Design a protein around this motif. Structure first.
Motif, PDB file in Angstrom:
ATOM      1  N   UNK A  77       0.834  -1.201   0.000  1.00  0.00           N
ATOM      2  CA  UNK A  77       0.000   0.000   0.000  1.00  0.00           C
ATOM      3  C   UNK A  77       0.869   1.252   0.000  1.00  0.00           C
ATOM      4  N   UNK A  78       2.028   1.154  -0.640  1.00  0.00           N
ATOM      5  CA  UNK A  78       2.999   2.237  -0.657  1.00  0.00           C
ATOM      6  C   UNK A  78       3.812   2.134  -1.942  1.00  0.00           C
ATOM      7  N   UNK A  79       4.906   2.888  -2.008  1.00  0.00           N
ATOM      8  CA  UNK A  79       5.720   2.964  -3.207  1.00  0.00           C
ATOM      9  C   UNK A  79       7.179   2.759  -2.831  1.00  0.00           C
ATOM     10  N   UNK A  98       5.291   0.622  -7.904  1.00  0.00           N
ATOM     11  CA  UNK A  98       4.191   1.457  -7.449  1.00  0.00           C
ATOM     12  C   UNK A  98       3.403   0.712  -6.375  1.00  0.00           C
ATOM     13  N   UNK A  99       2.279   1.288  -5.953  1.00  0.00           N
ATOM     14  CA  UNK A  99       1.414   0.587  -5.015  1.00  0.00           C
ATOM     15  C   UNK A  99       0.560  -0.461  -5.713  1.00  0.00           C
ATOM     16  N   UNK A 100       0.194  -0.224  -6.969  1.00  0.00           N
ATOM     17  CA  UNK A 100      -0.570  -1.193  -7.725  1.00  0.00           C
ATOM     18  C   UNK A 100       0.308  -2.206  -8.425  1.00  0.00           C
ATOM     19  N   UNK A 123       2.820  -1.621 -10.268  1.00  0.00           N
ATOM     20  CA  UNK A 123       3.429  -1.102 -11.482  1.00  0.00           C
ATOM     21  C   UNK A 123       4.943  -1.030 -11.336  1.00  0.00           C
TER      22      UNK A 123
END
Ligand SMILES: *[C@@H]1O[C@H](CO)[C@@H](O[C@@H]2O[C@H](CO)[C@@H](O)[C@H](O)[C@H]2NC(C)=O)[C@H](O)[C@H]1NC(C)=O
Ligand SMILES: *[C@@H]1O[C@H](CO)[C@@H](O[C@@H]2O[C@H](CO)[C@@H](O)[C@H](O)[C@H]2NC(C)=O)[C@H](O)[C@H]1NC(C)=O
Ligand SMILES: *[C@@H]1O[C@H](CO)[C@@H](O)[C@H](O)[C@H]1NC(C)=O
Ligand SMILES: *[C@@H]1O[C@H](CO)[C@@H](O)[C@H](O)[C@H]1NC(C)=O
Ligand SMILES: *[C@@H]1O[C@H](CO)[C@@H](O)[C@H](O)[C@H]1NC(C)=O
Lengths: 242, 111, 116, 185
Positions: C30-32, C51-53, C55
């Motif tokens: 839930x972070x980067x 990324x968080x998703x 990516x």
């Protein structure tokens, strides 16, 4: 109304609009030259007026220049991941164009917020507006926004001297849904009317060949054809001049 | 393309020195955000001035150079005996999330 | 923000190093997070992001070969590589941050990694 | 006193439909999944639209997603019930909504409520194209005759109309008494 709107919507509250019982001349805006790109996905730029969908969806938000390239089917990029997640089978045409002449303003245009960070990507067309401050670290923030706690949104502040990568490109993406009868269709041409010549006519529904002569049969206000004792067409109501 | 700079800029202790950061207008004249970097030999890459009007929480004040259009420049005031290090630059390209950096500005303060 | 990298070495063409940056102080879920490296006597070289998703992005020389991953929780954080050549000797450092926005302020401790 | 105004349609009629208000100034429609009360009355949404002494007939049939609404505002001076007589119904609207409708209602006199059936009529168009009479071709032998002839006046004689059979009453099914499951395993 949607394209030439005066009040566009921010991207963190990206819009949607179901349009029905419309005649949608896609080409009268395809031949506008006021667009940066007509990047159709699923269909062609032309060859839309011969389509009949149930409804179309007009999203009305603004992004930066490179975020146009971000907008594309099944992409990986800040906006395509946290603001407007196109499905990979998206049937429509993204229609973006700069507004650095229109929406930009001196000192900046701070009215736009993009979804800065969030835990995960969205469902297709998922409209996320919740402003729950980012939770991270090991504790809820309770409004103070401590370490690893942040706002899910970030203001743009469009500066009129920003490069093409940061200039406002008001984007409006349309989608096509087919479920039910189709209430939206491109217009249909209607040629001139020739009489007393063996022609191959095609009135709105019916076809056939014959010699159209001005008659004196008085249909009823709602009727459309006539017929003979053997159920062959015998009269047609001219759908432009009755 | 990259934030290439003159790698060696000097000056007298106490006075000021300009450390530039030069790239193309595709980015440096496009965004709101440019970040500066500096490294004491061996130290982890230390950012200096992100969001040029801003700095990190407790990092001291004699930093905060600016960005003069197509070319940036760090203005360090009050050069003290602890102001000898190596300097760098950092910002974002205009493609595929690409983050760019500087060619390496060894801040050679005269001993 | 106690992040401790581990896994460097020296590799002939074909091997694969899997770094392990502990994420005790800061959630990686839930972070980067971003990965970087620096050639001795050079500005930084962005090599990876997450990324968080989920990516991911890599730079020119590392896209297609570099593969970053990490466990679901904040245990670890990796950087896998493939098809190593003599060009890739550079001291590694971990960079808390993601891209230009949300700058890189917090950093790792640094693992000496040499590829030849 | 122009009392019976509205309609309501659909399949659940509670948050899961049509509507035709007539709220005294402007015909309305909607297809929004309305929540009208369980006691709808008028005091004193992939669609929309805006704008005794009288007998405001109607017909509603929604076949193939189209909801056609024939009508006729024929007048009368009557006080008891449905005035015997004939008046064709001319299609008024046609909506391409496509709901499933298996219930309806009314809003606010009398309002009779038939129910169509798959009949076979013999309509008599006059010189203008206006229906003037019809013959329910399943009503009585005289009507079945008028139908098979395709005429409204049937001359003396004997005509053959239909083919009558007895329908089977029971369903005898006999099978050899076996209980063993068949060795398919
Ligand atoms: C269809 O559009 C045509 C457009 O010309 C209409 O034709 C006009 O009708 C008006 C009636 O007052 C007259 O002036 C002419 O006969 C026509 N031309 C012009 C320039 O007005 C026609 O009435 C429309 N019909 C329907 C059913 O929409
Ligand atoms: C067909 O309709 C016409 C009207 O369009 C009827 O003829 C008119 O009837 C009215 C009676 O209300 C007279 O006042 C008119 O003088 C008539 N005009 C014409 C031209 O006939 C006609 O009666 C209808 N057809 C039939 C068989 O009744
Ligand atoms: C009647 O219904 C329409 C339908 O929207 C509504 O706009 C209007 O306010 C209502 N009342 C009157 C007096 O028209
Ligand atoms: C209507 O009934 C058909 C019958 O199969 C069904 O497929 C359809 O989902 C139904 N739609 C609604 C809105 O009830
Ligand atoms: C044969 O195997 C199938 C699947 O396991 C099972 O459903 C079936 O009952 C078996 N046959 C018999 C006779 O039990």
């Amino acid at each position: 109304e949607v394209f030439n709107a005066t009040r566009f919507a921010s991207v963190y509250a990206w819009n949607r609009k179901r349009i029905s019982n419309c005649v949608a001349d896609y080409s009268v805006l395809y031949n506008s030259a006021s667009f940066s790109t007509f990047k159709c996905y699923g269909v062609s730029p032309t060859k839309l007026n011969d389509l009949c969908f149930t409804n179309v969806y007009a999203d009305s938000f603004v992004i930066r220049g490179d975020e146009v390239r971000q907008i594309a089917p099944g992409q990986t990029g800040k906006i395509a991941d946290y603001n407007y997640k196109l499905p990979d089978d998206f049937t429509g045409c993204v229609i973006a164009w700069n507004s650095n002449n229109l929406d930009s303003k001196v000192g900046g245009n701070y009215n736009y917020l993009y979804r800065l960070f969030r835990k995960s990507n969205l469902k297709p067309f998922e409209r996320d507006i919740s402003t729950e401050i980012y939770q991270a670290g090991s504790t809820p923030c309770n409004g103070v926004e401590g370490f690893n706690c942040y706002f899910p949104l970030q203001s743009y502040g469009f500066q009129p001297t920003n490069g093409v990568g940061y200039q406002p490109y008001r984007v409006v993406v349309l989608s096509f849904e087919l479920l039910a009868p189709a209430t939206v269709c491109g217009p249909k041409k209607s040629t001139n009317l020739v009489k007393n010549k063996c022609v191959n006519f095609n009135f709105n529904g019916l076809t056939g060949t014959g010699v159209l002569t001005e008659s004196n049969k008085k249909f009823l206000p709602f009727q459309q054809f006539g017929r003979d004792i053997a159920d062959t067409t015998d009269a047609v109501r001219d759908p432009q001049t009755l | 393309s990259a934030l290439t700079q003159p790698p060696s800029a000097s000056g007298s202790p106490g006075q000021s020195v300009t450390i530039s950061c030069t790239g193309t207008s595709s980015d440096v004249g496009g965004y709101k955000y440019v970040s500066w970097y500096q490294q004491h030999p061996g130290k982890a890459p230390k950012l200096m001035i992100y969001e040029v009007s801003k700095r990190p929480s407790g990092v001291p004040d004699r930093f905060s150079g600016s960005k003069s259009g197509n070319t940036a420049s760090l203005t360090v005031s009050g050069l003290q005996a602890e102001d000898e290090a190596d300097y760098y630059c950092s910002s974002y390209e205009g493609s595929n999330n690409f983050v760019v950096f500087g060619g390496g500005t060894k801040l050679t303060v005269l001993g | 923000v106690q992040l401790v990298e581990s896994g460097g070495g020296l590799i002939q063409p074909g091997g694969s190093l899997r770094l392990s940056c502990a994420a005790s102080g800061f959630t990686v879920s839930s972070n980067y997070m971003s990965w970087v490296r620096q050639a001795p006597g050079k500005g930084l070289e962005w090599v990876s992001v997450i990324y968080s998703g989920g990516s991911t992005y890599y730079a020119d020389s590392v896209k297609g070969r570099f593969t970053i991953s990490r466990d679901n929780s904040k245990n670890t954080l990796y950087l896998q590589m493939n098809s190593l050549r003599a060009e890739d000797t550079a001291v590694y450092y971990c960079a808390r941050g993601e891209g230009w926005e949300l700058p890189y302020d917090y950093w790792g401790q640094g693992t000496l990694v040499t590829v030849s | 006193s122009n009392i019976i105004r509205g309609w309501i349609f659909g399949t659940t009629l509670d948050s899961k439909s049509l509507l035709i208000v007539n709220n005294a100034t402007n015909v309305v429609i909607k297809v929004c999944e309305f929540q009208f009360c369980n006691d709808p009355f008028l005091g004193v949404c992939t669609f929309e639209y805006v704008s005794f002494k009288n007998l405001r007939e109607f017909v509603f049939k929604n076949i193939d997603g189209y909801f056609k609404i024939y009508s006729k505002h024929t007048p009368i001076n009557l006080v008891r019930d449905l005035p015997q007589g004939f008046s064709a119904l001319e299609p008024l609207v046609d909506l391409p909504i496509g709901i499933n409708i298996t219930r309806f209602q009314t809003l606010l006199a009398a309002y009779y409520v038939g129910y169509l059936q798959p009949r076979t009529f013999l309509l008599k168009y006059n010189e203008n194209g206006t229906i003037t009479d019809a013959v329910d071709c399943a009503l009585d032998p005289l009507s079945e005759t008028k139908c098979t002839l395709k005429s409204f006046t049937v001359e003396k004689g004997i005509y053959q109309t239909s083919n009558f059979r007895v329908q089977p009453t029971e369903s005898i099914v006999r099978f050899p008494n076996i209980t063993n499951l068949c060795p398919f395993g």
